[PDB]
Amino acid sequence: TERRKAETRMEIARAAARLFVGQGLRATRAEDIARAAGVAPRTFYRYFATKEEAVAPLYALGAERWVRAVREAPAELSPPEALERAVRHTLTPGSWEWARTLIRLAESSPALRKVWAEVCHSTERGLVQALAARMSGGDDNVAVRLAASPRLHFAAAVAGASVRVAAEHWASSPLEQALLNLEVLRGFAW
Amino acid sequence: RRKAETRMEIARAAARLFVGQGLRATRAEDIARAAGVAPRTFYRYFATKEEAVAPLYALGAERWVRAVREAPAELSPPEALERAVRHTLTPSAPSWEWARTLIRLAESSPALRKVWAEVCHSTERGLVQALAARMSGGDDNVAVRLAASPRLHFAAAVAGASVRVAAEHWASSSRSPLEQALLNLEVLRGFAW
Q1: Which of A109, A165, A183 would you mutate first to test chain B, the one with the most B CBs within 10 A?
Q2: What's B60's domain CATH number?
Q3: B121, B124, B149, B185: best mutation site toward chain A, by most A Cβ within 10 Å?
Q4: Closest residue of B to A166, CA-based?
Q5: B66 FRET partner, CA 20 to 30 A, in A89, A180, B119, B131?
């Protein structure tokens, strides 16, 4: 593995975030982010095509924590339990306000909305792979069948949406909403 | 204005090429040539080759939202939702067959997946406005309250996902997206409007 690429990507991301909240997206330019990250423009563009794409790593961070929390939940737990536990772990504060502002920024920028939508959408497949495993009964072979299941694809989307929508509303106006939202899966044919 | 006309011409050109030659083989410059436009003009509208398909995707998504809005007023939201799904996912095979291919392409390209995810997500806000109006009782003032409702935001997301997921599976296998979408929607049976 080489996480150095990954290390540098985050450093740039954290720089972009401070600037976007500090000065706004329009005022901030890709070149300014590079300066802020203590790196050359050529390097910036090696990793990101545009200023807005530079936030993705921060978003990915929140989303991966959620998926990991589902995967790491104790085996004995049921999926909706695992889902409830995951939500609570992430969205009950471990900063917090800075998250609120970064998501808030997406409401006002199409380009940032794209990044946000893209990160959340990617999370879905991961989440299917987490849920599939949990129900798998240990057989990877049995699991792979379930991960190709449209029913599971939809459930994953609904769980994702429960958190994402809450987060979005929280930012524009999250725990209480996400949990309320999840209730819609109560009956779900897992 | 003109932008949209131009944007679609480029998009149709990209699509023909992606199916004709594949995504990797095709470059942004080739799309411009195909669209009868200079590269500078291409980049005026799109940052990358994959972003050029968005207008085609937007087309399918706007059909779905429009079908919710255009449903007869007397219809209840879930009825309106049911009507929209049926309209949106009941087929002009060349038009239906193209869609299947373009969505299929997303399964194999991360960059296209981004474009696909972004178009479907945009649809959500439009849909909340449509649903809010339906329940509005005509008062825009009463409507705006409902459009700020987190319960409605979630329901809109779930309806969107019901169609999108079905569409995605439809594209990847050798059926009707309709059956899956409706099945998926069942999760809103007795949702609180």
Answers
A1: A165
A2: 1.10.357.10
A3: B121
A4: B150
A5: A180
Domain count, chain B: 1
CA distance, residue A92 to nearest chain B CA (Å): 19
- Which chain B residues have a beta carbon less than 8 Å from that of A187? 187
Tokens of B40: 């500078």
* B148, closest residue in chain A (CA to CA): A169
- Are A27 and A62 within 8 A, CB to CB? no
Backbone angles phi, psi at B46, to 5 degrees: -130, 140
Tell me the nearest-neighbour CA distance from B154 into chain A, angstroms: 6
Q: For helices B77-88 and B110-136, what crossing angle results, to 10°?
A: 140
- Look up residue A107 and give its two tokens: 């409401």
Provide the experimental method for this PDB entry.
X-ray
Q: How far apart are CA A116 and CA A122, in angstroms?
A: 10
Beta-carbon contacts of residue B6 (< 8 Å; ≥ 6 apart): B37, B41, B45
Residue with tokens 């949106």: B88
CA angle B66, B72, B74 (to 5 degrees): 135
Residue with tokens 């255009």: B70
Contact in structure between B165 and A150 (CB atoms under 8 Å): yes
The boundaries of the domain holding residue A94 are 1-190
